């Protein structure tokens, strides 16, 4: 995921599906003028493509 | 009487002081011989990993406490991301140095002091007396040697373990980011706090052995003495090194407390 | 003593740290078991957690 | 057979502590004993307790009350200085003060006793050694265990509130109000069983090594030794599960 600004959130912060944890966060890196944040969640929940 | 007792204590003091020169030129063997001793223990304690285990299972206590009880307050409060910045000032600034003081004083301490007492009592000082060498040059003065030379692996072990035990049972047992409580610690932690806790650490081992080189050196009755001397020289052990953090903390973040949070 | 240099401290000794390792155990779940402490659980369906724990 | 070795030794030490559990509910009490040790360990483990706990508690006050004027909390202070002292520091200065002195103590006493063929003298005459020495000195060592924990919270306490009070000039209302803010009934109820266990368990350590001592010329000594080690060992590691279990219960929760 891109976001424009990634402030306080670190590598193995988690990751929610409605307040419930499903996976962690893998990683954080500069990319131009935007963040790019790859993070995964446990492949037992679904999530909508958009 | 108490001003004799503290003048032989001091000419004790002086006198495996003045002999360490002495000591590291002419006994560079028995210097090994006690380094390896004291980092690997002796007798029935050296078979579990000596004074290395003693100082590691401590240390993982004390950070083990230090998370819990921190996570449990301020999960309570509300305020629960904190604990890695409040983990690292509770381990450096007060509990990891007295800790590591008092398991160094029960081990090393109290196994100089039962070697020096046995020494006492089977005339081997005698022995070493009557071929000519100075006894407080050979013993004590090898001995403060070997254990200047064995604190700061033990130092940095026990603070290496008690990090790992605080950042074990926050990050998993409470289950809190690596990431944050990483942050929040490498934030708030200045090297220059670990570089004087070391020298306190350094101070502090060079006085409990002294104390404890006094307390066997000069054993009397037998073998039933030396074990009441290795209890006298545990107080005194105990009460010189929480002085001796006192004072160093007292000195050094008197005026500048050396930690920035608000504006 | 002859009690205490007798030929059984294997036995003892398991026996003891068993017991040692089931009062730590129970003890730290006293609160929690079920046999002693059982309450009915109900449930509730809700958009989101909101910060609950 | 590498675990089998100081298995033998666990299981000596718990079949003697069963023995002495059996002697106190079944036999009759020794009371004199019981007095003579309860005062033996007081006065080899009162000053060293005070002179140990009063630069702890100084210390930690200093750190908490420099840290949280950075923070800008620093009329919450004493809630910290209770909650430390309460359920750490007391216990703590208890196993330290306990082990070191009265522990080593009692190892070295029962180990005069044993290499002075007592023990073997005591046990011709038909006696039981369980009894008429290791209840005394176990009930003793609990007793002043708890007295000790008990002093020892008392004095940080207030040595806590005048080194931040004269020194630190924090407010003395901020602190005296505060105290019972994350502090109550089962942190003094946590810190009474630590207490009592810590001394149960140091007065059977000791009691266990000096009746098995291996005479010699630095057998006492080893003894000694080796006594006070275990003694830190098991105290931390109780204290460690007791922490666990009394944070369980909380005050704030």
């Given at each position: 995921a891109?976001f424009?600004e990634?402030?306080a959130?670190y590598?193995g912060?988690?990751?929610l599906?409605?307040?419930v944890?499903?996976?962690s966060?893998?990683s954080?890196e500069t990319?131009?003028?935007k963040?790019?944040?790859?993070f995964?969640f446990?492949?037992?929940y679904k999530?909508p493509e958009? | 009487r ?10 004790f003091?002086?006198?495996?002081i003045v002999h360490?020169?002495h ?10 011989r006690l ?5 690997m223990?002796?007798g029935?304690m050296?078979v ?9 299972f401590?240390t ?6 230090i998370?819990?009880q ?5 999960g309570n409060?509300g305020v ?5 910045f ?8 007060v509990?990891?140095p007295?800790?590591?003081g ?6 090393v ?5 039962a070697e020096?007492?046995?020494?006492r009592?089977s005339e ?5 007396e009557?071929m000519?060498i ?15 030379i ?6 940095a072990?026990?603070?290496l373990?008690?990090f ?16 944050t409580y ?8 200045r ?9 306190e650490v350094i101070i502090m ?8 080189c006094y307390?066997?050196?000069?054993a009397?009755?037998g073998?039933?003495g ?5 209890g006298?020289?545990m107080?005194?052990?105990?009460i010189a ?10 000195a050094?973040?008197?005026?500048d407390?050396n930690?920035?949070?608000?504006v | 003593?002859r009690?205490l240099?007798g030929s059984?401290?294997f ?6 740290v068993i017991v040692?390792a089931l009062?730590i155990?129970?003890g730290?779940t006293?609160?929690?078991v079920?046999m002693?402490?059982?309450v009915?659980t109900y449930?509730?369906?809700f ?7 | 057979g590498?675990?089998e070795?100081?298995?033998?030794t ?11 559990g059996?002697a106190?509910?079944?036999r009759?009490?020794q009371?004199?004993?019981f ?14 307790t005070?002179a140990?706990?009063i630069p702890l508690?100084?210390l ?12 800008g ?5 004493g ?6 002292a309460v359920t750490?520091?007391?216990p703590l200065?208890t ?8 522990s080593?103590?009692?190892c ?7 290499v002075?063929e ?5 046990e ?6 369980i009894?008429?020495?290791v ?5 003793a060592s609990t007793f002043?265990?708890?007295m000790?924990?008990?002093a ?11 080194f ?5 000039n924090v ?6 109000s505060?105290?019972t803010?994350?502090?109550?009934f ?9 207490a009592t ?8 350590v000791?009691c266990?090594?000096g009746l ?5 010329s630095k057998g ?9 080690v275990?003694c830190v060992v ?7 599960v007791?922490?666990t ?6 005050t704030?929760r």
């Amino acid at each position: 995921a891109y976001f424009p600004e990634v402030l306080a959130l670190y590598p193995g912060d988690k990751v929610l599906i409605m307040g419930v944890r499903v996976g962690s966060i893998d990683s954080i890196e500069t990319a131009g003028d935007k963040m790019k944040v790859v993070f995964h969640f446990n492949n037992k929940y679904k999530v909508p493509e958009n | 009487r108490f001003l004799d007792s503290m003048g032989h204590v001091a000419w004790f003091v002086v006198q495996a002081i003045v002999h360490v020169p002495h000591a590291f030129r002419h006994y560079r063997r028995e210097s090994l011989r006690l380094v390896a001793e004291i980092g690997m223990g002796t007798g029935a304690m050296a078979v579990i990993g000596g004074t290395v285990a003693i100082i590691g299972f401590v240390t993982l206590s004390a950070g083990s406490l230090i998370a819990i009880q921190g996570f449990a307050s301020l999960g309570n409060i509300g305020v629960e991301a904190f604990t890695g910045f409040f983990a690292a000032l509770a381990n450096i600034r007060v509990v990891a140095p007295v800790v590591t003081g008092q398991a160094l004083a029960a081990t090393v301490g109290a196994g100089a002091t039962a070697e020096l007492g046995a020494m006492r009592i089977s005339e081997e000082v005698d022995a070493l007396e009557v071929m000519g060498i100075k006894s407080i040059s050979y013993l004590v003065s090898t001995r403060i040697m070997a254990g200047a030379i064995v604190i700061i692996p033990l130092y940095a072990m026990a603070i290496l373990l008690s990090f790992m035990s605080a950042q074990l049972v926050t990050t998993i047992f409470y289950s809190q980011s690596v990431g944050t409580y990483e942050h929040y610690f490498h934030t708030f932690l200045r090297v220059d706090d670990v570089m004087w806790s070391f020298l306190e650490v350094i101070i502090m081992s060079v006085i409990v052995m002294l104390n404890h080189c006094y307390f066997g050196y000069f054993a009397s009755g037998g073998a039933v003495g030396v074990g009441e001397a290795v209890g006298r020289s545990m107080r005194t052990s105990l009460i010189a090194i929480v002085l001796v953090v006192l004072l160093a903390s007292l000195a050094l973040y008197g005026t500048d407390p050396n930690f920035n949070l608000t504006v | 003593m002859r009690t205490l240099q007798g030929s059984d401290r294997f036995r003892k000794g398991l026996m003891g740290v068993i017991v040692v390792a089931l009062i730590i155990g129970v003890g730290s779940t006293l609160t929690s078991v079920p046999m002693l402490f059982a309450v009915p659980t109900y449930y509730g369906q809700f958009a989101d957690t909101g910060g609950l724990n | 057979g590498q675990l089998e070795k100081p298995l033998a030794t666990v299981g000596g030490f718990f079949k003697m502590s069963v023995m002495t559990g059996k002697a106190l509910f079944t036999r009759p009490f020794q009371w004199k004993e019981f007095v003579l040790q309860s005062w033996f360990l007081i006065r080899v483990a009162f000053l060293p307790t005070l002179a140990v706990s009063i630069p702890l508690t100084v210390l930690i006050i200093f750190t908490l009350n420099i840290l949280l004027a950075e923070f800008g909390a620093a009329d919450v202070s004493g809630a910290g200085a209770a909650l430390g002292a309460v359920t750490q520091l007391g216990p703590l200065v208890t196993v330290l003060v306990v082990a070191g002195a009265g522990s080593t103590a009692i190892c070295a006493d029962l180990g005069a006793r044993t290499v002075r063929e007592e023990i073997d003298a005591l046990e011709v005459l038909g006696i039981d050694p369980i009894e008429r020495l290791v209840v005394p000195r176990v009930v003793a060592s609990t007793f002043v265990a708890f007295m000790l924990n008990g002093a020892v919270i008392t004095i940080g306490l207030v040595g806590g509130f005048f080194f931040g009070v004269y020194i630190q000039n924090v407010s003395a209302g901020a602190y005296v109000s505060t105290l019972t803010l994350l502090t109550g009934f089962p942190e003094v109820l946590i810190s009474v069983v630590k207490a009592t266990l810590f001394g149960m368990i140091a007065g059977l350590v000791g009691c266990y090594r000096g009746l098995t001592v291996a005479g010699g010329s630095k057998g006492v000594g080893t003894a000694v030794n080796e006594t006070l080690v275990l003694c830190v060992v098991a105290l931390f590691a109780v204290n460690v599960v007791l922490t666990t279990i009394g944070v369980r219960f909380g005050t704030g929760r």
